[PDB]
Amino acid sequence: SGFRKMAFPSGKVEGCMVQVTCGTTTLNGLWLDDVVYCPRHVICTSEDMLNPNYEDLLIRKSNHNFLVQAGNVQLRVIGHSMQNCVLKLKVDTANPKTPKYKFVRIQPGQTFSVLACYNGSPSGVYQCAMRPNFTIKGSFLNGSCGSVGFNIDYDCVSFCYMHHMELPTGVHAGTDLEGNFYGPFVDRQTAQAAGTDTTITVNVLAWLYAAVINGDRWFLNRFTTTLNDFNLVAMKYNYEPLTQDHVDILGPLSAQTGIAVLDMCASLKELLQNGMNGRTILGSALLEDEFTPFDVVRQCS
Amino acid sequence: SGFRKMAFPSGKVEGCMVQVTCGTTTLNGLWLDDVVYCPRHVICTSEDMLNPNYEDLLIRKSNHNFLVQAGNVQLRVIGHSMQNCVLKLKVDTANPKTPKYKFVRIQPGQTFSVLACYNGSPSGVYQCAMRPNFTIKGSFLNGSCGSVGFNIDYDCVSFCYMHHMELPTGVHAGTDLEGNFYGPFVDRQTAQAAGTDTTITVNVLAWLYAAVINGDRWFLNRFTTTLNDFNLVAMKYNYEPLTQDHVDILGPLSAQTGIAVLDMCASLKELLQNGMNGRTILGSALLEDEFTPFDVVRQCSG
Ligand SMILES: Nc1cccc([N+](=O)[O-])c1C(=O)N[C@@H]1C[C@H]1c1ccc(Cl)c(F)c1
């Protein structure tokens, strides 16, 4: 037993991290087969960043303007192109450590591991969720741009996030590996602010089911709720609406514990109303919303 | 910005995890050069586990009784011996992925990364502290025995923990890689319990410094304290005593934030006395004690 925010083992991703330099800017790139993926803003000066014309900046670059360093070795850039907000640098060597992989674009509520890196060198691994407002609450310093988020279900790495910037409130914004931003964000210095954030209700319920599985029942009550009534109350505490999809997804945890979904919803309503009264749930004094139904099944069963 | 429970990248350790089977028991082993390290209890049945004579059980085993699988390949065991509570299986192949490493024993309060594994296959990585009571609050199912804890200190992996068992309260117990248990535990089925635990005061203060660095400042006040006065407070709340050594270690964070350690202790005193009054610190409604001063500096400056 126990319940921990657990990340995927990072080794398959570590062997793909490289350093990309352009001019005086250095950041991280992801080296898969013979392509290095990194944020296109590597081509900008900070002046450029207010209103950058990336097509104009990029046409002025040659291959040899891009320095790619994989551990100790320089790779030769033999092509470049831009796809959305990512630069794809074609290199002369396929990465021999390329894992089985895919690119997947995730939805708010989904969790993933982040391998934080500086100068193409991995620093640490931690677990994150895509927030309803399409940001992530990461831990990133200057130089972390191009660090990636991923899941590994089986031996296949699913890359879902590449880090581009920190917003003024200290949360983080980035793209999928096709270079499409999550959220309304752009790789420009403008007034862009994260929408107010909400709690990921389906994940809190999942975690309540994890608490029950692990022997913890104090927060249950004799009540049920309709879905609509649950949503009317939940929204008053800045919780995301729960949809029939979410109810469906929680079906297996429901069957395992013998607690119907809307019965667990009634428990959540009461917790929001009463707080915890000096108690903890799975060691937390707050309701945790960064474990998905899938993650609870993975870690608990 | 931001502050997360962060593990070391696990790649160097993943390439050393193997599956060890003996009879019906399968668990995880650590393959370094030509030795596989795993819990000696792999040799026991359930009955044996009540009152095991390890030396007697072991002498009855041949090399071929140990099936070691590294991914798809069987390794051939060519020798076996015991050091304390760990079994050392000599194999015919050196691990080509052996990192630079050392075996180090950690002190209570120190943190490390755990790579959780099942059937020699790594499944997750998380960050733990060695509790004052010598347990760890891990996350482990059956099959996890032989999973390892480590720090990385350059390109050098320092292995500090190997998982042996879960205690009745759902916390975990294990050994260093020389097979010495952390805490007063034994590898047999008897009644064993975690002792009462305490909060790691130096780590809480570290985390308060992390909060300040990240712009969370509401708990700072104009007051200061002395070590002795604070220590009277710590004792009352089941916090570890703070020593001059602790104060010394927090020196760098003190200089960077302009909050002296005993200044921050005055903050912590007030938190323990008055609670958080509806507020959070780095997203938490409890005081976090599983980041060391070094961890905060490493994450907040490196
Ligand atoms: N300077 C930082 C400090 C701490 C942490 C981070 N971070 O998590 O990346 C940064 C940061 O935002 N770095 C980016 C180069 C900066 C940039 C600035 C604006 C736009 Cl639109 C962009 F795409 C890129």
Ligand SMILES: Nc1cccc([N+](=O)[O-])c1C(=O)N[C@@H]1C[C@H]1c1ccc(Cl)c(F)c1
């Ligand atoms: N029962 C469990 C349930 C869930 C997770 C775990 N776990 O964390 O490993 C266990 C557990 O303790 N497994 C050990 C083989 C069992 C054993 C039993 C007793 C003694 Cl003293 C020993 F060294 C070993």
Ligand code: NA
């Ligand atoms: Na003070």
